[PDB]
């Protein structure tokens, strides 16, 4: 029932609005689209693609948007198995949903799902197997009982997520269970220079700007600390009451979010 | 049942169908059977019957088969409490388990314990993590008071099996109880055929005898060796679908399987 | 219930919440003119006795919107699976009652590292810290509901939720400087007599390593300390004995005096 409610229904986001991760998609859409779009080229060799890929990275690194960016692109059912909908009390009422979860998926074709932040349930590695009753132990062993032991299905794509991978089992690095461990990690300069531009489309700044200065001025940072720049940079002009942005404004916007001097250089 | 077998006081394994000893088993005949047989003397002297015993030595000796066996002669309930399988990381709940069993033993009318690997209790405390080692004595110390409080019964006997004696020196717990501490043997070369005579029975094998077996059993003096050689020597006469053993398989068995019983 | 004209000091700190909350309801055409939308989130560092909760309750006085009342520990529950539902409840209703504000305080109760425990109860908060994340930025946008969260120490706490997407500015407070102690003192004392002794620019001074809250104790501890002398109005030396007291056991520099 409730599982029918959680469905994507078309958020608006492209792959044009993502930058430095110009190759890490080339692993992600290699497993999702092609077996669902172009399975013949694998078939020309005739092998089993991976299914049940994963992605891990630091926080704010830009992974959730991809998981919805892939939704509008595929024109296929996107399913969100989010938290607070798998670990309800009254045992049997918790782990039945995951059984019912796949059952919708086993029925339907051309289907892919999403598990947001599996660190809740999968991350609950049994504390030395302790606890005479472990409500999460039983419901984690079922999906691997769904996915390993014997084949769940043949055409369904799965992607997990994790801000913190070391929690969950050593059984979720293993075929059937899991195939790939993608790693989103911090950008480089040529990525950042293509993350600024998208967040500054709407912005009403005038040219005379060289973001090459800025990326050399913004060290190791996330893909979300680079939008907050665009807020505060655009904001200082507001308390100073100007109808346009400068470049120098960024230079004292950058100083805050990253945050007395190393005079020895 | 929940915990252990309890043997229904009559499951009668043969304490003499065994290549063990006569002196030790007769040393135990004193502390258990004599009072339960003959209270007319301890009463006459007024001494209370004894308080438990230790049986050191590493395995192969059969330091658990005799125990439940003589318990079967007298007919008490035989159970376990392996201290390796009693420790729990939580603060209490290692002592609770101690408290259940002294109670639950008394829920039954007779009952006797078989603790094993009790060095988990008696540790040297070389780490000295006071968050832990303050508790290690806490659960241990509860044993000392849970074991001999008001219990004036003549049924609730105690045993503790402890490989590696004297590894414990936080406390030797000497004074009072442990009225014996048996000087355990190992299987002497004379006892080999005393042992091989045990398991060889119940077989039609054209004999399968030899004096080249104790030499083979030299340094493999553990009861599992003989149990297993008779096992696998039984698996070689069928290796060719034969009808009866040859003793060369025994001279082959112990020579070629005590290897693991001497290197690891 | 309080208002502005009751702080005086915090000015470099206060312009932000204005820019987050009090303003955009008024003149959002500013933000869009640039092509920009304001923050969804705020946080306030600790350094206690410096006026954190005071600021939040101020804006409630004039906000023209719905405002909420939570401390970090009302979230948690007992039945092991009902906590995290409660978080989604408060955010959806705020949307139903939008435009709205929340205020979760002392959330060091909740916010801790992924400690990877073995208890059985400390897990059910980590999930409760997590639906928040999955709710707050998560997968889908939420609209115009703003967070003003607070704490007292963060230097090893509040692991991951502290990032853009969820929170954007990190105001911090400390014990004030000399310049602010001037005007803040006028605040409390603007109802008493102050007979003739004022001299206030030496009363408060550096090396009085005190707070921005103890001063009202000093203000009030003096009046009765003069009342008991049957003198309702006040002089200076009323305050001198007070400052002698309340400062006594804040700090001691016995380990100082080495950097000669």
């Amino acid at each position: 029932s409730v599982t029918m409610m959680t469905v994507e229904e078309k958020p608006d986001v492209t792959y044009s609005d993502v930058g430095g991760c110009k190759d890490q998609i080339e692993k992600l859409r290699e497993v999702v689209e092609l077996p669902l779009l172009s399975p013949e080229r694998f078939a020309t060799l005739g092998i089993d693609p991976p299914k049940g890929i994963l992605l891990y990275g630091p926080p704010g690194t830009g992974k959730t948007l991809c998981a919805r960016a892939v939704a509008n692109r595929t024109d296929a059912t996107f399913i969100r198995v989010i938290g607070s909908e798998l670990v309800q009390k009254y045992v049997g009422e918790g782990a039945r949903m995951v059984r019912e979860l796949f059952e919708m998926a086993r029925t339907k074709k051309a289907c892919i799902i999403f598990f947001d932040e599996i660190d809740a349930v999968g991350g609950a590695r049994f504390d030395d197997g302790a606890g005479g009753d472990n409500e999460v132990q039983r419901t984690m062993l079922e999906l691997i009982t769904q996915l390993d032991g014997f084949d769940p299905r043949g055409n369904i794509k799965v992607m997990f997520a994790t801000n913190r991978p070391n929690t969950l089992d050593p059984a979720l690095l293993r075929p059937g269970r899991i195939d790939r461990k993608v790693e989103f990690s911090l950008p480089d300069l040529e990525g950042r220079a293509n993350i600024f531009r998208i967040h500054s489309k709407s912005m009403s700044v005038e040219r005379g700007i060289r973001w090459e200065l800025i990326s050399r001025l913004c060290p190791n940072s996330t893909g979300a600390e680079l939008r907050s720049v665009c807020t505060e940079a655009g904001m200082f002009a507001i308390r100073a009451r100007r109808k346009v942005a400068t470049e120098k404004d960024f230079l004292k916007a950058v100083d805050k979010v990253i945050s007395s001097r190393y005079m020895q250089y | 049942l929940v915990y252990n077998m309890t043997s229904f006081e009559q499951g009668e394994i043969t304490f003499d169908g065994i290549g063990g000893l006569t002196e030790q088993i007769r040393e135990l005949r004193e502390v258990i059977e004599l009072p339960l047989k003959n209270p007319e003397i301890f009463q006459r002297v007024g001494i209370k019957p004894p308080k438990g015993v230790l049986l050191y030595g590493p395995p192969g000796t059969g330091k658990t088969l005799l125990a439940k066996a003589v318990a079967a002669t007298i007919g008490a309930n035989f159970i376990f409490s392996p201290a390796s399988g009693i420790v729990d990381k939580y603060i209490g709940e290692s002592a609770r388990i101690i408290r259940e069993m002294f109670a639950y033993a008394k829920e039954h009318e007779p009952c006797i314990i078989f603790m094993d690997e009790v060095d988990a209790i008696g540790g040297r405390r070389f780490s000295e993590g006071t968050s832990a080692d303050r508790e290690i004595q806490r659960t241990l110390m509860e044993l000392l008071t849970q074991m001999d409080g008001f219990d004036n019964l003549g049924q609730t006997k105690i045993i503790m099996a402890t490989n590696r004696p004297d590894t414990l020196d936080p406390a030797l717990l000497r004074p009072g109880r442990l009225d014996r501490k048996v000087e355990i043997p190992l299987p002497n070369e004379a006892g080999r055929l005393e042992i091989f005579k045990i398991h060889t029975a119940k077989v039609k094998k054209t004999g399968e005898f030899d004096f080249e077996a104790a030499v083979k059993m030299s340094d493999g003096f553990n009861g599992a060796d003989i149990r297993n050689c008779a096992t696998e020597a039984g698996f070689f006469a069928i290796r060719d679908d034969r009808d009866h053993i040859n003793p060369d398989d025994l001279m082959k068995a112990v020579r070629k399987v005590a290897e693991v019983k001497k290197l690891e | 219930t309080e208002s502005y004209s009751d702080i005086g000091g915090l000015e470099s700190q206060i312009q932000e919440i204005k820019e987050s909350v009090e303003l955009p309801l008024t003149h959002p055409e500013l933000y869009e003119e640039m092509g920009i939308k304001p923050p969804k989130g705020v946080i306030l560092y600790g350094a206690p006795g410096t006026g954190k909760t005071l600021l939040a309750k101020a804006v409630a006085n004039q906000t023209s919107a719905t405002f909420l009342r939570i401390v970090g520990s009302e979230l948690i529950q007992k039945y092991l699976g009902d906590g995290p539902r409660l978080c989604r409840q408060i955010f959806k209703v705020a949307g139903e009652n939008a435009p709205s504000i929340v205020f979760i305080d002392e959330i060091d109760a909740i916010g801790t590292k992924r400690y990877d425990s073995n208890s059985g109860g400390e897990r059910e908060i980590q999930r409760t810290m997590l639906e928040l994340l999955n709710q707050l930025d998560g997968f889908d946008d939420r609209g115009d509901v703003k967070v003003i969260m607070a704490t007292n120490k963060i230097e090893t706490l509040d692991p991951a939720l502290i990032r853009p997407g969820r929170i954007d500015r990190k105001i911090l407070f400390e014990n004030p400087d000399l310049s602010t102690k001037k005007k803040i003192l006028g605040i409390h004392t603007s109802k008493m007599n102050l007979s003739e002794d004022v001299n206030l620019e030496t009363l408060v001074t550096t090396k009085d390593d005190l707070s921005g809250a103890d001063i009202q104790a000093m203000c009030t501890e003096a009046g009765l300390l003069a009342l008991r002398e049957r003198r309702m109005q006040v002089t200076a030396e009323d305050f001198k004995q007070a400052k002698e007291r309340v400062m006594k056991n804040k700090v001691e520099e016995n380990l100082e005096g080495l950097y000669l």
């Binding site: 409500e135 | 939580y90 | 092991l80 073995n118 208890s119 400390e122």
Partner: peptide, 16 residues
Amino acid sequence: NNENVSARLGGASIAV
């Protein structure tokens, strides 16, 4: 059907 389970409703636990 009032087989209302105790819900496995958690509780703290001291360590080590």
